[PDB]
Amino acid sequence: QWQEDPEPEDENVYAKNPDFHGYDSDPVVDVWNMRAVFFFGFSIVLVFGTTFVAYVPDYRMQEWARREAERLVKYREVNGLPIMESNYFDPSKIQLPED
Amino acid sequence: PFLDIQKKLGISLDRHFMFLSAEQPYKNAARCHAFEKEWIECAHGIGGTRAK
Amino acid sequence: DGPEKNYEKTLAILQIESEKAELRLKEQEVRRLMRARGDGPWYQFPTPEKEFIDHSPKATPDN
Amino acid sequence: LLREHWVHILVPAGFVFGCYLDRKDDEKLTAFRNKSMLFQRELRPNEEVT
Amino acid sequence: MNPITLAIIYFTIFLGPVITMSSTNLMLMWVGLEFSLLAIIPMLINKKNPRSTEAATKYFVTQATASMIILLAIVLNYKQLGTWMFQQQTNGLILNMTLMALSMKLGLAPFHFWLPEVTQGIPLHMGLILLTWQKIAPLSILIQIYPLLNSTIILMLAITSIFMGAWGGLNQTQMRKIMAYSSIAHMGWMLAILPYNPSLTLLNLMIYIILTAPMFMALMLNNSMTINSISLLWNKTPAMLTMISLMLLSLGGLPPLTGFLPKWIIITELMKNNCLIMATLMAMMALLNLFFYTRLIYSTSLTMFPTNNNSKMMTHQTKTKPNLMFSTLAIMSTMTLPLAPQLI
Amino acid sequence: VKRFFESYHEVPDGTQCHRKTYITTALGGICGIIGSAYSVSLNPADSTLEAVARVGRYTFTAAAIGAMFGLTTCVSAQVREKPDDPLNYFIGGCAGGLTLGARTHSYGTAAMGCVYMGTAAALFKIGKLEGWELFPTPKV
């Protein structure tokens, strides 16, 4: 047979670092890494991200659109016009081909 | 050519005895001197696609 | 900033790109005409040099 | 202390460099600054809109 | 070999192509080719072993026949027009014989069978020259006559070269034969784009040279003429993997790397000329080159092979081989896509 | 004089079946002659008899390929009035691959050639119709 090291063996971590957190064997580094994770992902992004996104105004005009639609319905129902026609473009300016 | 170092330095190593209308030693004329002279002089400046 | 900035910036981008497109499609046809007619500055294939022809008497009248 | 804590000047410097290059890009593309058929204003309160 | 002999032989090796490219007279071009041949043979045969002698013999015979055919073409043109330069009036047979001869001089298929044998029998610093510096004069002679060539036979030669290069590199386990078939493929690309745009032939030429020189230097670092020998590079010199892998991917022609641009822009021009079917065939068959380059990237940089013991003493020893050109050319060849509009 | 192979495309498919099959058969024979010359010069044999037998094998094989392809195509165009349909050439290519598999005694080769030659012939016809050019001249 040939030269090679033998398969290693499982290694409990809690035996030496019962306060283990998952990141590094060095306890202080483990702790500061988990702290950085929790303070930059949870305490900031999710919180301030949610805040900013929630207070983005008029996302894609879905609010101005409702306001303007109310204005239009009022104008039209008041002046007897209909609320919406069957042709977007006025068929006057258009010039159809004659067969 | 591919690298006009000759024309760059304004010299002549190989481009003076190419064709028949060139300079012969004791002014000896070549056979088709006039025909070739005319062809060249008429194709000068419009090279290739036109001259063909 | 307001939306007018993005609006006008998009308009300028569109201008630039449309100009590029016109120029490319004109380049193709110009190159085609030049390759097929030899009437321009490109694709002017070479010819012999008339400066090396001899224009002196030749020891015989007929050439 | 610097040899281990000077690496905190790169990524924010990168953010600022990015903002600066965006500023350059929009200093370009200046055309149509007020020639849009929708936002043609009259320059009454200022000298440059965008 | 003493300094005087070295100087004379290498000055001739350098002068050959220079005359070829700086001369208007086809006779002087032929002279340059003969210089190249004469001055290359001794370097091939330096080691004086049966394999090198056989390689030299094959090279000599092939190149000499090719030169004779080229000179026949020249003589026929001379009887036909009185001038020593091809014009728009030479019988196309003359030019097709000339193209066959130039293709055998280069190593294109189906005139390629000699290239792998010779390169194998030859050392590394000689394959480098044979595959980079000895492609410049025969390609120049073609660049000078690109308007009056036969696209049909050119494209047939190019596509045959692509195909056979792929189907050779798939099987060869020897560095030098792999390089030979890669040369065949890239020269096929060159010929393909030649009659439409030769600036791109020259582009791909310089790209392939920048990509090949540093690879042969990498090899010469340990004289690893084999896959199982270059696999030990992780224990001998592992600071070369990050660059061997990238240069091989560039050769293969992977998008984000210099080596891509040649294929891309050549395909563009062929599309403008309605050579889309040929461009498609070539682009699909380059993936085999990419395949047998990935198979080497694996054995070199993405998995460790069974090593040896005396490699320990090899580690003990120091080294001063890889001069600055290695790094310079590898960087220029791997990280220069953002500058493609200038190289075009 | 090269018009033997141009008489194939002077009439819609479904006509002149006999001469069309003759043309495809000549094409097969030529391709086989070239292949056999190459395989005889490289990778040669022992006896000139075995060599000429290799030649005959390859030539008759390719000739059968071409004959079956052309005949099946024109027969499909006959039984169905569709002279501008690449499906006929696909069927012909599959028949050619079938004949190749019958000769070489390999269902693998049979189906592989079927698919490949079918695509090849269909794309050939598509080019003929649309206006594709193979080996075109420079225009940039």
Next chain:
Amino acid sequence: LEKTIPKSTSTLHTNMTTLTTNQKGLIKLYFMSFLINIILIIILYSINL
């Protein structure tokens, strides 16, 4: 779905690889092949013209 696409690709290309790389270093055969090439090219030219 393995037998069809990838295994077929591999088989095809390995077989053509063997074909094209079954070469023995015989200059006679290489040059006979070169001669076949010359003949084919001359014929293409003289035929199409």
Next chain:
Amino acid sequence: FYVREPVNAKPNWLAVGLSVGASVFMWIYLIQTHNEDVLEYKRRNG
């Protein structure tokens, strides 16, 4: 402490000086060239 005292035990001050001088001269010539080209451009175009 080694036993084969190498070539690199101390720096090549000639190479150092030449490199630094070449760099400084490159930058000086580059600045001068750029400024001169700008001056010529503006002379030609107004």
Next chain:
Amino acid sequence: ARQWQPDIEWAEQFSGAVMYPSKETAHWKPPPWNDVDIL
């Protein structure tokens, strides 16, 4: 466990004159390591 790394069985398949030896005419043998044949 741990990362599997090639063994002799996996590395000796790159050691023949040519890969994919599906041929029966490929009686060849690896060339020398110094290009000096045996005699």
Next chain:
Amino acid sequence: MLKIILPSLMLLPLTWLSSPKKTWTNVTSYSFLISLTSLTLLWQTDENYKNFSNMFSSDPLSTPLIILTAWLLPLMLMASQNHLKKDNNVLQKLYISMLISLQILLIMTFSATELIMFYILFEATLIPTLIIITRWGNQTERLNAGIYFLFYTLIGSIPLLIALILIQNHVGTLNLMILSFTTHTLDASWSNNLLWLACMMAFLIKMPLYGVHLWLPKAHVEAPIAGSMILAAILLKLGSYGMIRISIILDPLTKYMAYPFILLSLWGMIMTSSICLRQTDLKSLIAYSSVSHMALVIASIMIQTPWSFMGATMLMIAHGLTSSLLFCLANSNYERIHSRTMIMARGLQMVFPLMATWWLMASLANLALPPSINLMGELFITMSLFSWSNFTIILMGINIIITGMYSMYMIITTQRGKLTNHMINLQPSHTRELTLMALHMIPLILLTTSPKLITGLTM
């Protein structure tokens, strides 16, 4: 956009000239800050889209992909940490650099305007993935897996390039929205049909069609967890983005040159959801789940309706998050048992009583439990295909059933039996991986609360 890309480019030096103890921490924190900054793209107060340059642009369809890409990074950092822990500092810095390069290229190709830039980046995404899968896998078939992945992709991508050139020549640009304001109808000829095939097959391969799905299960099973995550979340989305962007010019061909792919998708959906019932490898099960879910995306792009595209985008993002979550959950066990076999370890939820919840919710999502964006996508795809033809509901219901079956199978054969009491090596749950699962879930809650950021172009 450059304020998003330059810092991602600077994460590299940080990584290399950071000390061997603070590189993970620093790069993860700054990656989180990048994810944060990427939310500028969500400031869309008008129906006009963003255009920062001639080279970059953002849309309601590219913004979510970009933010998910910038969010997944620190999660992959955290997940690739327990393994390659003993590996050398240099090797793990290499790993981090690979991850960062993937991030940058994916952001670029989502923010791109030109199809050819999109192409070079969608094809440069191969190098880091191949390297991660081959240099850090544990089996011996990762090499063949990389071969399959690489070459499927390239074989699909070449004709796309050729079609892009043909277009760049006919039209004078490959620029988006110009290809829109100038698009013409076509002639319904065979050349244009082959143009369609070319433009499409690349993306139909990068998101596995039924018949060419034979690179995803391999790559997953043989790849590490970060590779698995990115492959499941974004690399399967490049195809969707590309098709949603390229289908605008191929009109009106997809009305009839799309049937085969709709059929293959609606059938392979069933034929993979069923494999998810009798596969033994948890990772391959989840891979086939990804396939059965991307089939819907394909069939919904094919029919070109607003509801269809909306559902496609919703399901894209939702499946990204959920698949990453499930992969990390299986990895938590693998790290403890070194076997992907599902029926080996059982009776959990006794020693890991909390991770049994994450296991459960990731399953509630995959089987489309309302209210959820998985369902808000599936439902609209179903409605669009029912308007297309009412007989699709049959196959949709069959797939729904099989999904509800194999999700709970995966739950019960791992967490809801009785324990394999002979398992001494069940190290308790790490805060790190619990945080992974929480970071995966919470954004799903938030996107279920505000699914206006996830509809897409139409809405």
Next chain:
Amino acid sequence: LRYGLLAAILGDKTTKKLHEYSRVITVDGNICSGKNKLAKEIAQQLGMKHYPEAGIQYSSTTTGDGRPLDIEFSGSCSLEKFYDDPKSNDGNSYRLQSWLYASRLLQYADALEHLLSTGQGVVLERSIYSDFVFLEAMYNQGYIRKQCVDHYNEIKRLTLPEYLPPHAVIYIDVPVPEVQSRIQKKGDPHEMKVTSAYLQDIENAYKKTFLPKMSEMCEVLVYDSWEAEDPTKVVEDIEYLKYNKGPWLKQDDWTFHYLRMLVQDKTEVLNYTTIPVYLPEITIGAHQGSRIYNSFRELPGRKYAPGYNAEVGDKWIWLK
């Protein structure tokens, strides 16, 4: 500046220094013969240099700080274990033979470069021309396999011919019972477990292959124990020696130059010892290899290149 074409053109040539006694001599024999003493005395009486026998730590001693290294960093082999338990299923026997051939080759080179740059002749102990006797002995005894033997012969063919042979070969002949007695007296709990069969196989290899093979290209001088220990006879024989029949006369300045380049580049020396022939006795796995290499580079004075390790007192690392 380094030696090369330029130095050889400028005047750093060879033939300007080949004074008589610019030779290379070997003092071979059996194991416990007076080789060290005789060779030191010859070196003194002829002004030449002495290169002692090369073992498992020759490279560790010639490179770096000069101190030895763990056996896993230099050799992974043990002569003690070879004498204690041959036939082992580990591979120590051939894994030791190969490393010792490599070290003897490195030593031959380190001596040739010294002899060519400086005319000071050299005297060595058993060399690459005689290492094979200890291999043939093990093969005839059953400690090694024909595969290992063929691997050894192949590396020998690849390496040896590129080197010049010795001028004078002194063979100190001694019989196996006297050798065993000398071993018991000297005292070594492991050497004292060796076998007269092995010793006689060594002697027979010597007399039947080495002497014939070498008397045709270098002057042989065979002596016994009592002619030895009276060295002046040996030294005067050498001084009288005629130096024909060798290739050293076919050599000019430029052959010497192209040999000095090889001998100076210590990696083209071992490229062929490092061939990937996969013997289970030397084939090291990737994990073991990587661990050993990374630890070797972790060690001091070995991480970076010689003039670039500050932890050992290297300054100016920012300008060289």
Next chain:
Amino acid sequence: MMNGRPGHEPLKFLPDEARSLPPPKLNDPRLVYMGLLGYCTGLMDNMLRMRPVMRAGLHRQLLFVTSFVFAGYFYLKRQNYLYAVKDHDMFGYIKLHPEDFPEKEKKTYAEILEPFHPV
């Protein structure tokens, strides 16, 4: 292609017809990228020679950067000249051949009837 044109000087890097174009600025992204490549070449040279990357050969790295920027400036000038010449010739030909470059008769969408395609 553009070699054989009137007013063509052989083997010249930069004629005087190019001194009228605006020169590139040293802050140009391409020059900066060439500087980056120089620095990376230095670092790779060290990494291959087994020296401390980023802590060795400062003069070497400086030389690399300087040479790269130097070559880039001039090569960029040249390529800009070439592109300008290309546009020049193209527009000149367009102006001398008005018979093959006619202004399109661009209509308005109110007249041309484009076909409609449901779903």
